[PDB]
Design an enzyme around this catalytic site. Sequence first.
Site, PDB file in Angstrom:
ATOM      1  CG  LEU A  12      -4.222  18.913  16.881  1.00 53.93           C
ATOM      2  CD1 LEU A  12      -3.917  17.465  17.244  1.00 53.93           C
ATOM      3  CD2 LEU A  12      -5.506  19.007  16.050  1.00 53.93           C
ATOM      4  N   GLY A  13      -3.676  22.598  19.842  1.00 54.89           N
ATOM      5  CA  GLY A  13      -3.938  23.317  21.065  1.00 54.89           C
ATOM      6  C   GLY A  13      -2.670  23.811  21.722  1.00 54.89           C
ATOM      7  CG  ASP A 135      -4.049  19.186  36.554  1.00 59.04           C
ATOM      8  OD1 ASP A 135      -4.903  19.741  37.294  1.00 59.04           O
ATOM      9  OD2 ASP A 135      -3.611  19.713  35.505  1.00 59.04           O
TER      10      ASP A 135
END
Length: 274
Positions: A12-13, A135
Site C-alpha cells: 500500500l505504500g 510529526d
Amino acid sequence: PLESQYQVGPLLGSGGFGSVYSGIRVSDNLPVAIKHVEKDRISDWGELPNGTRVPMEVVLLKKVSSGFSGVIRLLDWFERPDSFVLILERPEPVQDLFDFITERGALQEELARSFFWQVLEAVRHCHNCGVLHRDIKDENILIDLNRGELKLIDFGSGALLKDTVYTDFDGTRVYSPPEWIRYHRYHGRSAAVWSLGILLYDMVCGDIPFEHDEEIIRGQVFFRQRVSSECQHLIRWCLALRPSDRPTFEEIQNHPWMQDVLLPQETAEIHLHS
Ligand SMILES: Cn1c(-c2ccc(N3CCNCC3)cc2)c(-c2ccc(CO)cc2)c2c(Cl)ccnc21
C-alpha cells in the site's frame, strides 16, 4: 509464525515509515496493515518492561493503544533478524489526508473544522498517555471514509512526553516551530500546537504556509484562499512566534471557530458521499 497468522496483499505504500502491505488476520478476517521496517533504518530505539530493545514506535504505540478510535492501534508485532514487522488496524475504505487534500484542494471550513477537531482529540489522547507525536501532518492522518473518522499514524519520530526542553528533532522541518530552527530547543506541547497551526492552514488553503527556514522564522502568514476571519485568527494564534503566546488545547477547542463541530458520521454523509 507471521505468515500463518496473516494473509499478505498488495503493497500500500513505502516511505520514511518503512513499507506497508494490506493484510488479513486469518483468525477472524480482520483487515490489517502489515508494516515492515529495517533495523538499520530505525532512527530511534526504545524498550518494554521485559528487556527487549525495540523501535521507539512500538513503545509509543503500546502506550496509546487503548480502544480509542483516533489513533491507529497496534495489534501485534514480530521481530525478524534484520527487520521488525508491525500489525496495525486498517480501515476500509481508507484514504490518507495528504492524498485527500491533493484530490480536492482546499477543504470547506465545515469539513476542516470536523477534521481539525478529531485531530485535536487524538493528539490530546496521545499526550494523556504520555506520548508526544512530533510529526503531526496531513501525510500521517488517515480518513476512515465510511465513518468519517480520522486516525493518527507514524510514531517513528515521537518521544515520551516530558515537561523539560527537547534538543533533538527528526520530524518534518516545514512543520517544525521557529524555536527549533533558531535554537534547536522546543517544548512538546507548544511545538505540537505550532504543527497543528501548519496543518489547519494546509486544510483550508490546500498547501502549507511556509517552505523555507526564513519564512518559518519570520512567521508572517499570507492567505492565498478565502478563509473566514475566525479561522485566520485561530491559525495565526497557533503560529505565534513565541511559544508562550500559543493557545493551549483547551483554548483551541474553546475558540469561536471550533464551535458546533459535526459528528464524524454526519461528516461522512455530507462530505465523503458516504
Ligand atoms: C503508513 N500507512 C499507510 C500509508 C500508506 C501509504 C502512504 N503513502 C505515503 C505518501 N502518500 C502516498 C502513500 C502513507 C501511509 C497506510 C495507508 C494505507 C492505505 C492507504 C490508502 O490506500 C493509505 C495509507 C496505513 C494504514 Cl492503513 C495503517 C497503518 N499505516 C499506514
